[PDB]
Structure 1
Amino acid sequence: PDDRVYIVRAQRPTYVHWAIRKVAPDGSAKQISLSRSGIQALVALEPPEGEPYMEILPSHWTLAELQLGNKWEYSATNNCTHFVSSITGESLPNTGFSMALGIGALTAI
Structure 2
Amino acid sequence: ATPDVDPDDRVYIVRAQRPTYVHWAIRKVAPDGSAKQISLSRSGIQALVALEPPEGEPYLEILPSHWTLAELQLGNKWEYSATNNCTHFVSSITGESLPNTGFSLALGIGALTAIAASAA
Distance 2:20 2:111 in 1: 7
Distance 2:82 2:110 in 1: 13
- 1:87 is matched with which residue? 93
Distance 1:105 1:71 in 2: 16
Instruction: Write out per-residue CA displacement over residues 43-70 of structure 1, whole angstroms, 9 at most, x where no aligned residue.
Output: 0000000000000011110000000011
Per the normalisation by structure 1, the TM-score is 0.99
Larger Rg: 2
2:33 is the counterpart of 1:23 = no
Instruction: Write out per-residue CA displacement over residues 80-102 of structure 1, whole angstroms, 9 at most, x where no aligned residue.
Output: 10000001110001000001011
Distance 1:32 1:74 in 2: 16
1:74 deviates by 0.2
Provide runs of 4+ in structure 1 moved above 3 Å.
none
RMSD of equivalent CA atoms: 0.5
3-state secondary structure, aligned to 2:65: helix
Distance 2:104 2:71 in 1: 25
Distance 1:55 1:73 in 2: 27
Distance 2:71 2:19 in 1: 27
3-state secondary structure, aligned to 1:83: helix
Match of 1:74 among 49, 72, 80: 80
1:13 deviates by 1.7
1:79 deviates by 0.4
Q: Report the count of equivalent residues.
A: 109
Distance 1:93 1:39 in 2: 24
Instruction: Write out per-residue CA displacement over residues 7-40 of structure 1, whole angstroms, 9 at most, x where no aligned residue.
Output: 0000112100000000000000000000001111
Structure 2: runs of 5+ lacking an equivalent? 1-6, 116-120
Per the normalisation by structure 2, the TM-score is 0.90
